[PDB]
Amino acid sequence: PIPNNPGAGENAFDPVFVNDDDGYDLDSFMIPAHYKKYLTKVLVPNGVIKNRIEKLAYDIKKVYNNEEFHILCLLKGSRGFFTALLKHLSRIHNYSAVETSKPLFGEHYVRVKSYCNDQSTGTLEIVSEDLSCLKGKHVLIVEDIIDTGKTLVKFCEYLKKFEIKTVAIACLFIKRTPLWNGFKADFVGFSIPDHFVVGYSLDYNEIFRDLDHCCLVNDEGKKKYKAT
Amino acid sequence: PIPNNPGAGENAFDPVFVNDDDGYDLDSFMIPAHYKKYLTKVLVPNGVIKNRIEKLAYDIKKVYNNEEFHILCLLKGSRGFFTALLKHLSRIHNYSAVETSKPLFGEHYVRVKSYCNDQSTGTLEIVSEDLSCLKGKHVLIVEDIIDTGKTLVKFCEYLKKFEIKTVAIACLFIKRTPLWNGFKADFVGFSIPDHFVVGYSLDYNEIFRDLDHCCLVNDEGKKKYKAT
Amino acid sequence: PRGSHMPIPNNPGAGENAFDPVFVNDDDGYDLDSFMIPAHYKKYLTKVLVPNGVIKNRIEKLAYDIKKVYNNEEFHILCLLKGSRGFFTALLKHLSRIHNYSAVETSKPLFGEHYVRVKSYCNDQSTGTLEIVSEDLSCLKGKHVLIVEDIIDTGKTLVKFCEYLKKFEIKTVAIACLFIKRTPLWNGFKADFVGFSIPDHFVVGYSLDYNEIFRDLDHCCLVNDEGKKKYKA
Amino acid sequence: VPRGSHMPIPNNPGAGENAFDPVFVNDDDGYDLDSFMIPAHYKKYLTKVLVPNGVIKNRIEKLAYDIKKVYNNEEFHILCLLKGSRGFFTALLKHLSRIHNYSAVETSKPLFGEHYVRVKSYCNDQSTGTLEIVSEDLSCLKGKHVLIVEDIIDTGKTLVKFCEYLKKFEIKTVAIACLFIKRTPLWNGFKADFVGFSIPDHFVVGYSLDYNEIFRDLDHCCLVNDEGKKKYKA
Ligand code: HPA
Ligand code: HPA
Ligand code: HPA
Ligand code: HPA
Ligand SMILES: [Mg+2]
Ligand SMILES: [Mg+2]
Ligand SMILES: [Mg+2]
Ligand SMILES: [Mg+2]
Ligand SMILES: [Mg+2]
Ligand SMILES: [Mg+2]
Numbered sequence: 001p002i003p004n005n006p007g008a009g010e011n012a013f014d015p016v017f018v019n020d021d022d023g024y025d026l027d028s029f030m031i032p033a034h035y036k037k038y039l040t041k042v043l044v045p046n047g048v049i050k051n052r053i054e055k056l057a058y059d060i061k062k063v064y065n066n067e068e069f070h071i072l073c074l075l076k077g078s079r080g081f082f083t084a085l086l087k088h089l090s091r092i093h094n095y096s097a098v099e100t101s102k103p104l105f106g107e108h109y110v111r112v113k114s115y116c117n118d119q120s121t122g123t124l125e126i127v128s129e130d131l132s133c134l135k136g137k138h139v140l141i142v143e144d145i146i147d148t149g150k151t152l153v154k155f156c157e158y159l160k161k162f163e164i165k166t167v168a169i170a171c172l173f174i175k176r177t178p179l180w181n182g183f184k185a186d187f188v189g190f191s192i193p194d195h196f197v198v199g200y201s202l203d204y205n206e207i208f209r210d211l212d213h214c215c216l217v218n219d220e221g222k223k224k225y226k227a228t
Numbered sequence: 229p230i231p232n233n234p235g236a237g238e239n240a241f242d243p244v245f246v247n248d249d250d251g252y253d254l255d256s257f258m259i260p261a262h263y264k265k266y267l268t269k270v271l272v273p274n275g276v277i278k279n280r281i282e283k284l285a286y287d288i289k290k291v292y293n294n295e296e297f298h299i300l301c302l303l304k305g306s307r308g309f310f311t312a313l314l315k316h317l318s319r320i321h322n323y324s325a326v327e328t329s330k331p332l333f334g335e336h337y338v339r340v341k342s343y344c345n346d347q348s349t350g351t352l353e354i355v356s357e358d359l360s361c362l363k364g365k366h367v368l369i370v371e372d373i374i375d376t377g378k379t380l381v382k383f384c385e386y387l388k389k390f391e392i393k394t395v396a397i398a399c400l401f402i403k404r405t406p407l408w409n410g411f412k413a414d415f416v417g418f419s420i421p422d423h424f425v426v427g428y429s430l431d432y433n434e435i436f437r438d439l440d441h442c443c444l445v446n447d448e449g450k451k452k453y454k455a456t
Numbered sequence: 457p458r459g460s461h462m463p464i465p466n467n468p469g470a471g472e473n474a475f476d477p478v479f480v481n482d483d484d485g486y487d488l489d490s491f492m493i494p495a496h497y498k499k500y501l502t503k504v505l506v507p508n509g510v511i512k513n514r515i516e517k518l519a520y521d522i523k524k525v526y527n528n529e530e531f532h533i534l535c536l537l538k539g540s541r542g543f544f545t546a547l548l549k550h551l552s553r554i555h556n557y558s559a560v561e562t563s564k565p566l567f568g569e570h571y572v573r574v575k576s577y578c579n580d581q582s583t584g585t586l587e588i589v590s591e592d593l594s595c596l597k598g599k600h601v602l603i604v605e606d607i608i609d610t611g612k613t614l615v616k617f618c619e620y621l622k623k624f625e626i627k628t629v630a631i632a633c634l635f636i637k638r639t640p641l642w643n644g645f646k647a648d649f650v651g652f653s654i655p656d657h658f659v660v661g662y663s664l665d666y667n668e669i670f671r672d673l674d675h676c677c678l679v680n681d682e683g684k685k686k687y688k689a
Numbered sequence: 690v691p692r693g694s695h696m697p698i699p700n701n702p703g704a705g706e707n708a709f710d711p712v713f714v715n716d717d718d719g720y721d722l723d724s725f726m727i728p729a730h731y732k733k734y735l736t737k738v739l740v741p742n743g744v745i746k747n748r749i750e751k752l753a754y755d756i757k758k759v760y761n762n763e764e765f766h767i768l769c770l771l772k773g774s775r776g777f778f779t780a781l782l783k784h785l786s787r788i789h790n791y792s793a794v795e796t797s798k799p800l801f802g803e804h805y806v807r808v809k810s811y812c813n814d815q816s817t818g819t820l821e822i823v824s825e826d827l828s829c830l831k832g833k834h835v836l837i838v839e840d841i842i843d844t845g846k847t848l849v850k851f852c853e854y855l856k857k858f859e860i861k862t863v864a865i866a867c868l869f870i871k872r873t874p875l876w877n878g879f880k881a882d883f884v885g886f887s888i889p890d891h892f893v894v895g896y897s898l899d900y901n902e903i904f905r906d907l908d909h910c911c912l913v914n915d916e917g918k919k920k921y922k923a
Contacts, residue, residue, distance in 0.1 A: 016490045028478050029513050030520060032322035034294045034329035047509020051491050051675070058492060075337050083311045094260035095791050101262040106434055109303050111337060111357055127357050128339075206334060210318045213513070244724050256712050257747050258754060275743020279725050279909070286726060323557050441747070494790040496797040537805050545779045552906040556728040563730040568902055571771050571807060573825050591807060591823045668802055672786040 002063060002138055002206075004166035006156045007149070009184025013059060015174060015191045016052055018043060022193075023216070035211055038221030044190060044214040049172070049200055050084055052189045056170065056182055057088035060140065063168075066104065069138040074155070076209070077109040077144035080201030081172040085142060108134070114151055116227050117205060118196040118217075120179075124154040131162045138166045144202055145173040149183030173197065173214070174197075196222070230291060230366055231396035234384040235377070237412025241287060243402060243419040244280055246271060250421075251444075261437055267426075269407030270388065272418060274440040277400070277428055278312050284398060285316035287415055288368065289332075289395075296332065297366035302383070303339040304437070305372035308429035309400040309417075313370060320407045336362070342379050344455050345433060346424040347443075352382045360448030363391045372430055373401040401442070424450070457621040463525045464600055465630040467613075468618045471646025475521060477636060478514060480506060482655040485678075494636040497673055500683030501660075506652060511634070511662055512546055514651045516631060519550035519674035521649050522602070523566075525630075530566065531600035536617070536688040537573040538608035538671070543651075547604060570596070576613055578689055579667060580658040580679075586616040593624045600628045606664055611645035635659070635676070658684070697759045698834055700862040702852045703845075705880030709755060709774060711870060712748060714740060716889040719912075731907055733919030735894075740910040743869070746780055747897055748885045752866060753784035755883055756836065759864075765834040768849070771807040772905070773840035776897030777868040777885075783840060799866065804830070810847055812923050813901060814892040814913075820850045831859045840898055841869040845879030867891070869910070892918070 003010060031039065068167040073082040086107065093104045111127040114120050139159075147154060152169065159167060171185035177194045198208035198217045207225045208217065231238060251269040259267065301310040314335070321332045338356035342348050367387070371380060380397065387395055399413035405422045420442075426432050426449075427439035435453045436445065465472060469646075485503040493501065535544040548569070555566045573589040576582050601621070608614060614631065621629060633647035639656040660666050660683075661673035669687045670679065679687075699706055718740040727735065769778040782803070789800045806824035810816050835855075839848060852863060867881035873890040888910075892901050894917075895907035903921045904913065 013489065016486060024478060025518075027475065027518050030322075032329070033327045034331075037327070045510050045513045047511070047513045048507045049509070051507045051509040055489075055491050067388045075333060079311075079335075083307075090440075092791065094258075094438070095788065097260045097262055099261045099265070101260070101436060103262075105438075107304060107307070107437065109337065109339060113357075126428060127355065129355060167252070207331060209335065210314070210322070210331060210333075212318075241723065242721075244720060252712060255709065255751075257751050273744050273747045275745070275747040276741045277743070283723075283725050320557070323554065423741040424841045492790075494797075495793050495795050496799075496917070499795075538803060541803075545775070548906070552908075556726075556906070559729050561729045561733070563728075565730075565903060565906065567906075569772060569775075569905065571805065573805060575825075585893075589823065589825050617743070669799060671803065672790070672799065674786075 002067065002069075003168035006141075006167045006169055007153065007183040009169070009186055009188070012184060012186050012188060013121045015188040016142050018190050018192045020193045029213055030132075031213070031215075032211065035208065036173050038218055038224065040216040040218045042151075042215050043192060043197060046200065046212040049080075049189070049214060053081065053084040053172070056189060057092055057186050059086055060085075060170065061089060061104070064103070064138070066106065067138060068102075068104070068106075069099040069140050070106045070108055070134060071140045071142055072110060072134075074110045074141065074143045074151070077107055077201050077203065078142050078172075079209075081144050082120045082142050083119075085170070092215045110155075112151060112155060118222060120150050122150060126149060126155070126158060131159070135163045136165050139164050139168070141167065143169065143171045143185075144200075145175065145197070146171050146183060146185060147175045147177060148179045148205045151183035152183050153181060172200075173202075229296065230297075230394050231414040232394040234369075234395045234397055235381060235411040235415070237397075237414055240412060240414050240416060243416040246418055246420045249422045257441060259441070259443075260439065262372050263436065266446055266452060268423075268446045269446040270443050271420060271423075271425060271443045272428075272442040274428065276309075277417070277442060281309065281312040281400070282316045283437045284415050284417060285313055285320055286315075288317060288398065289320045292332070292366070294329070294332065295366060296303055296330070296334070298334040298336060298362060299368045300336045300338055300362075302369065302379070303337055304370050305429055305431065306370050306400075307437075309372055310370045313398070318357045333368075338383075340379060340383060346450060348376050348378050350378065352379060354383070354386065359387070359390045362387075364393050366394045367392050367396070369395065371397065371413070373403060373407060373425070374399050374401045374408070374411055374413060375407035376407045381409060384432050400428075401430075458527070463527070464475050464529065464531075464628050465525070465648040466628040468603075468629040468631055469615065471631075473649070474646060474648050474650060477650040480654045488677075493674060493675070493677075494673065497670065498512055500680055500686060501679040502680045504657060504675045504677050505654065505657075506660065508674040511542075511651070511676060515543065515546040515634070516550045518649050518651055519547055519554055522547075522551060522632065523554045526566070526600070528534060528564065528566070529600060530568070530650045531566070531602050532568045532570055532596055534570045534572060534596075534601055534603050534611070536537055536603065536605045537571055539663050539665065540604050540634075541671075543606050544604050547632070565657040567602075574617060580684060582610050584610055584612065586613055588617070588620055593621070596621075596624050596626045598625065598627045600630070601626050602630045605633045605647075606630065606662075607637060607659075608633050608642070608645060608647060609637045609639055610641050611643035614645045615643060634662075691813040692761070697761075698763065698862050699882040700764075702837075702863040703849065703879040704867055705865075705882055705884070708882050708884060709878060711884040711887045714886055725909055726877045727909070727911075728907065731904065734914055734920060736912040736914040738909045738911050739888065739891075739893060741831065742896065742908040743912065745776075745885070749777065749780040749868070750784045752883050752885055753781055753788055756781075756866065757763070757785060757788045757800075760800070760834070761825050763834060764798070764800065764802070765832060765836055766802040766804060768804045768806060768830075768835055768837050770837065770839045770847075771805055773897050773899065774838050774868075775905075777840050778838045781866070801836075802833075805847050806851075808847060808851060814918060816844050816846055817828070820847055822851070822854060825853070827858045834862045834864070836864045836866055839865065839867045839881070840896075841871065841893075842867050842876070842879060842881060843871045843873055844875045845877035848879045849877060852889075868896075869898075
């Protein structure tokens with residue numbers, strides 16, 4: 001069964017659990033030198049994010065098999081997740097492909113914005129925009145992080161107009177915050193502590209996207225890069 | 229100096245030249261089984277594309293040094309180029325960074341559409357976030373291929389309204405076609421023969437983006453996947 | 457600063473100025489469904505202890521630490537086969553990139569490479585004897601040598617090996633080790649660069665084997681009782 | 690030709706009985722040194738890039754595929770000829786393991802064992818016509834399928850002598866994988882069963898291939914120039 005109850009995560013496998021005291025000190029891995037003074041610790045290293053995404057791709061391929069689907073990348077934060085996912089889905093599909101096979105997925109991009117500093121503004125700005133080509137298609141939303149769940153509730157509501165066949169959700173990180181509205185993903189990488197994360201395409205006011213590991217930003221970082 | 233004469237390629241290094249008789253048997257490399265019947269030959273393998281992009285990253289870092297710039301990815305065709313470019317630019321910058329360094333680039337996305345089948349429709353569809361956030365910034369346009377030169381000439385005209393400080397162009401492929409209007413990039417990967425190429429994010433009607441190598445689509449493929 | 461203390465280690469077994477490894481707790485790890493595991497191995501594994509990507513990221517940092525120590529001084533890397541293969545090739549890849557990225561026209565190559573096959577394990581236990589396939593190491597006379605070893609467990613392999621090296625009149629002997637196990641049987645031999653401290657359980661993957669099996673497993677995992685039984689020598 | 694009609698595992702070492710042709714690299718093929726990343730200090734000693742790193746890796750993935758299609762699920766033992774085959778061998782293992790383990794099911798088995806032998810014969814850019822051999826006891830290869838993994842066939846002397854040495858061990862089959870074969874008029878006709886590239890008769894360095902222990906860390910296969918041969922002369 002292809003998931004089609006967005007926010008319910010009806011048949012989702014557990015994520016990897018990153019415990020409240022888990023993580024690694026900054027001297028454990030390569031950290032760009034200028035970023036070190038703004039980070040408290042490494043939560044999830046680049047290579048483990050990548051290994052987990054490979055398995056997610058495998059889970060997605062096991063669900064869709066050869067049914068055409070359309071993957072929708074929420075820019076900008078989902079870039080890292082999306083690129084690793086495309087790499088691993090492609091290799092898994094194409095390694096098992098035979099002469100009578102066909103392409104597994106199409107790729108689409110929507111820019112959505114809602115954060116300022118370390119907080120949801122509670123509003124969602126969307127830029128795409130003709131998603132009518134998605135009518136009657138299976139779509140897989142690819143999102144970097146579910147926090148409040150507000151982005152995904154609002155975007156899923158917004159997708160209703162295009163008369164898409166199914167909407168499934170894949171999300172790299174879910175944060176254990178009391179602010180969460182209950183929105184669950186269908187494929188989920190990691191459950192993480194309630195702290196604002198940066199790295200692997202996740203930014204704090206556009207900073208730290210290029211940081212390879214998922215890290216916690218410290219108060220000096222939040223202060224230095226605050227919105228002005 | 230930082231380039232600022234879009235289409236002139238005033239100080240550009242030569243690309244790698246791929247001669248008209250260059251390329252490789254489809255049995256030389258891994259090719260997804262179902263695509264083989266639709267391809268003539270491999271032109272540039274994945275790995276050499278990646279090795280060329282690393283050097284282009286290096287070239288870009290040598291020009292900009294530590295001067296902040298903003299990279300504009302032209303979707304969807306530029307995804308593969310842009311992701312490898314980001315990977316290598318980040319490693320090169322962050323490897324040489326020191327505690328007093330800062331981030332080198334910001335990232336932006338513009339969806340730009342003009343082709344149908346193997347030819348330009350001669351019009352250009354543009355969708356992105358509001359580009360006035362680029363005012364007074366150094367901008368680097370990242371494009372997959374210059375063919376007719378129409379996309380870039382029109383897109384650069386359009387950027388004239390935003391009061392950007394400089395506009396430089398990085399292009400992965402330039403096609404030696406008599407249809408070319410003369411638009412030159414500032415950083416260029418490969419010069420290629422006059423044939424419609426697919427793979428490495430370049431499509432024919434949304435097909436073959438997931439193909440890892442740059443290949444020539446054959447007449448059977450053009451017919452099978454024709455717009456209808 | 458380098459004028460006050462020469463950074464290249466020269467007290468093998470002492471780990472005189474070693475950074476601490478990443479500490480992996482006994483209850484740390486992941487179930488087998490969290491990552492890619494070859495389907496036929498799953499029945500023989502308890503859990504993933506350290507994922508492949510963590511190991512690779514750690515090794516990049518070790519490369520960095522090694523480059524900071526040796527700077528521009530030529531040294532010779534000595535790979536203890538077969539188990540050190542994964543560690544060693546990751547280490548070379550990263551050392552070469554870090555060195556070659558910062559190199560200038562007047563720079564020079566940083567390291568030579570060398571291989572020795574040494575063997576001591578049967579099943580999950582050291583036999584207490586080290587077999588060395590002798591190879592002509594006199595090319596190491598008066599050179600800085602860095603031994604690259606997958607895992608320190610009892611420490612017997614490395615004490616016996618450093619003893620064998622004495623005859624070659626090497627200039628310095630430093631040790632890099634991917635894993636050190638917190639076994640009560642450890643003789644106290646410490647590495648100069650160490651990746652991870654792990655609990656006292658028999659691990660496989662990332663080139664580490666149980667009787668030649670599991671070297672191709674990408675993640676460091678614990679072999680279970682059924683695996684130990686199935687692949688018993 | 691189906692597997693019940695002809696057994697695919699090669700067993701006529703030196704004959705390359707059913708080998709796919711290699712990628713052919715022409716004498717005038719290649720790239721300027723500013724085309725790719727080259728360690729700044731090597732550039733004065735190199736003439737051009739002949740085969741870029743990424744091309745080699747992609748080729749090796751296809752060799753892994755070809756090898757997996759041949760052996761299918763039968764256990765074989767890979768024998769890495771040190772030091773020069775390191776690059777080839779580690780890329781080959783990475784891809785072979787992924788191809789095998791991606792298609793593996795619950796009842797599958799491991800595909801290969803790995804073994805190492807140090808062999809040596811070159812001084813400067815020429816074969817010395819003698820071969821030094823160092824390894825573990827290879828009697829563990831008795832009755833096994835073995836695949837020798839070799840960086841480069843040039844005169845073919847290393848491999849004729851090595852295969853002759855192997856005879857004492859009563860191995861079941863001996864197949865050869867080789868990354869480069871050089872079109873040298875000195876070639877004794879020893880052919881590999883799986884071969885990556887055919888290259889012109891010039892001394893190459895990079896991708897683990899050395900000139901007197903130098904250039905192994907160079908990522909791309911390049912030609913060493915005369916200054917390089919002079920500077921790093923034995
Ligand atoms: O913790 C976060 N970090 C970065 N972006 C986010 N968006 C929601 N939560 C986060
Ligand atoms: O050759 C091409 N292939 C794919 N897209 C293109 N856009 C311009 N030329 C091409
Ligand atoms: O735990 C281990 N696993 C594999 N090889 C080893 N050699 C010493 N300890 C170990
Ligand atoms: O051209 C070569 N380069 C390096 N090693 C070699 N061994 C035989 N030929 C060569
Ligand atoms: Mg967001
Ligand atoms: Mg954000
Ligand atoms: Mg276009
Ligand atoms: Mg297109
Ligand atoms: Mg062992
Ligand atoms: Mg040699």
